[PDB]
Amino acid sequence: TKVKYPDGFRSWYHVKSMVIQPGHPLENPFGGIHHVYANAEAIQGLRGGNYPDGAVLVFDLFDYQEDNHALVEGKRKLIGVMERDAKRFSATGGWGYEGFGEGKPDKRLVTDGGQGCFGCHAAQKESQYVFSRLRD
Amino acid sequence: TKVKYPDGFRSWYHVKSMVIQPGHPLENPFGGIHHVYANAEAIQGLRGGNYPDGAVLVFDLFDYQEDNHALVEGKRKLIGVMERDAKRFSATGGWGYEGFGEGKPDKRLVTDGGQGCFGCHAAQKESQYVFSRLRD
Ligand code: HEC
Ligand code: HEC
Ligand SMILES: [Zn+2]
């Protein structure tokens, strides 16, 4: 009943990126440059189909440094993970929610079985609880 | 002596990103959010191997909007392309250089066999003309 670490996620498909700066309500703790990646199964949900079991989205969050008005990636703060399993993750709408401190497998951040994540992600019920959209 | 449009580059390996904002010496023309992509042959050279002919690196440049302490991805401005060929492109260090306005195959921007591109990239002779470094 626990989200698997997504080995190899960095070689997956880059869906989009976004910068959250100090002052944004999500500053704590999602401030930084983030990138979104999807495995093959997730791409099919993003492309319009149903999300099948085994679908995985990753939120890869980096700290950054203003240097002469360029934003430069520094150290990874965390990764957030959504793993699709309609049965096993029934409780949180078919996705399991987990965090890994610094992207390391041994550093789970979620302490409430994922209801905090789901609390906010539920507003996107219309789109299967995913906020990101494929762009070209 | 003509660089191919790199079809399907969006499904390649995401190397890194960087934001260049108003003030920085490079806003004109490189202002915005950029992402770097590499095909298989380029990874070998990024990893510390040599670059095989057929290695391609892409710079994907997006405009951005300020949205409540977030920078959000807008329109693609252009892609820049480096295509590895030591014989075909010996005039510019064995890489071809080209740009496509708004990433469209028909909007070739480069008019000087890529000398303009190459005079800045030559600062990086020692890294074989590539500024990007792999990260985790
Ligand atoms: C609102 C207060 C949120 C909470 C709490 C959590 N997330 Fe979230 N998440 C939110 C937004 C607005 C976005 C989109 C960012 C963008 O670039 O558009 C996301 C994104 C993710 C993703 C990527 C997939 C997607 O839905 O777009 C993942 C994998 C993700 N978030 C995971 C996640 C986890 C594990 C959380 C609890 C630890 C969590 N999120 C909380 C908004 C909110
Ligand atoms: C200095 C005035 C530059 C000119 C002119 C051009 N480029 Fe460039 N390029 C420059 C930098 C500092 C970087 C690194 C960006 C980063 O985030 O690190 C790059 C990068 C590229 C890349 C990506 C591969 C790499 O070398 O890191 C490509 C594919 C690339 N540049 C292509 C390119 C082309 C086609 C140019 C002429 C149209 C061109 N560059 C000009 C600096 C400068
Ligand atoms: Zn404010």
Automatic annotation (TrEMBL), chains A, B:
CDD domains with a match to the protein in the record: cyt_c'_beta
Residues involved in Zn(2+) 2 binding: 66, 69
Residues covered by the Cytochrome P460 domain: 6-132
InterPro entries: Cytochrome_P460, Cytochrome_P460_sp
Keywords: Heme, Iron, Metal-binding, Zinc
Residues engaged in binding Zn(2+) 3: 69
GO molecular function: metal ion binding
Positions with a binding annotation for Zn(2+) 1: 27
Listed Pfam families: Cytochrome_P460 (PF16694)
Binding sites annotated in the UniProt record for heme c: 16, 34, 117, 120-121, 131-132
Coiled coil spans: none
Full protein name: Cytochrome c
Organism: Methylococcus capsulatus (strain ATCC 33009 / NCIMB 11132 / Bath)
UniProt lineage: Bacteria, Pseudomonadati, Pseudomonadota, Gammaproteobacteria, Methylococcales
